Amino acid sequence: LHKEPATLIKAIDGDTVKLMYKGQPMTFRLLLVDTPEFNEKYGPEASAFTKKMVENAKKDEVEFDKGQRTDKYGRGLAYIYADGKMVEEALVRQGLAKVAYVYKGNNTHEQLLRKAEAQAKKEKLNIWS
Ligand SMILES: Cc1cn([C@H]2C[C@H](OP(=O)(O)O)[C@@H](COP(=O)(O)O)O2)c(=O)[nH]c1=O
Numbered sequence: 001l002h003k004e005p006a007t008l009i010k011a012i013d014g015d016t017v018k019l020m021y022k023g024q025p026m027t028f029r030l031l032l033v034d035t036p037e038f039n040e041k042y043g044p045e046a047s048a049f050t051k052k053m054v055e056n057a058k059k060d061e062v063e064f065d066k067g068q069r070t071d072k073y074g075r076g077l078a079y080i081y082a083d084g085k086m087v088e089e090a091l092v093r094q095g096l097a098k099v100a101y102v103y104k105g106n107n108t109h110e111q112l113l114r115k116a117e118a119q120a121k122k123e124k125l126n127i128w129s
């Protein structure tokens with residue numbers, strides 16, 4: 001896999017971000033995680049966490065996996081990095097997202113995220129409290 005440039009257009013919620021990619025605006029849904037919706041417990045805190053990450057970073061990047069690059073809703077499907085930190089791993093490590101939506105062609109970083117989730121679960125963080 002490889003990282004590609006993108007620029008923040010705007011943070012949306014815990015696991016969706018609008019980015020400019022190859023000069024075109026698109027909504028990206030983070031691969032391999034599920035954050036609560038904003039109206040659910042820990043949703044605002046997830047949305048806040050992701051917003052800070054992607055806004056504060058000097059450099060946001062996208063990384064497609066090996067399978068589908070867009071979902072049925074036209075959202076891009078990628079891992080997102082903020083100054084080289086994977087947004088998925090940060091959220092999961094903090095108990096603000098669960099590993100989820102692990103589909104067969106697009107699961108390169110599953111075990112990294114599962115490891116992070118196990119540590120969050122151990123610490124009883126947020127969603128696991
Ligand atoms: C993360 C991800 C979600 N999706 C689809 C499955 C779910 O469809 P349904 O809407 O049909 O439940 C939906 C969940 O996204 P949200 O968690 O953003 O709602 O997005 C994929 O198709 N591929 C993926 O990699």
Ligand SMILES: [Ca+2]
Pocket residue numbers: 015034035036037
């Ligand atoms: Ca969600």
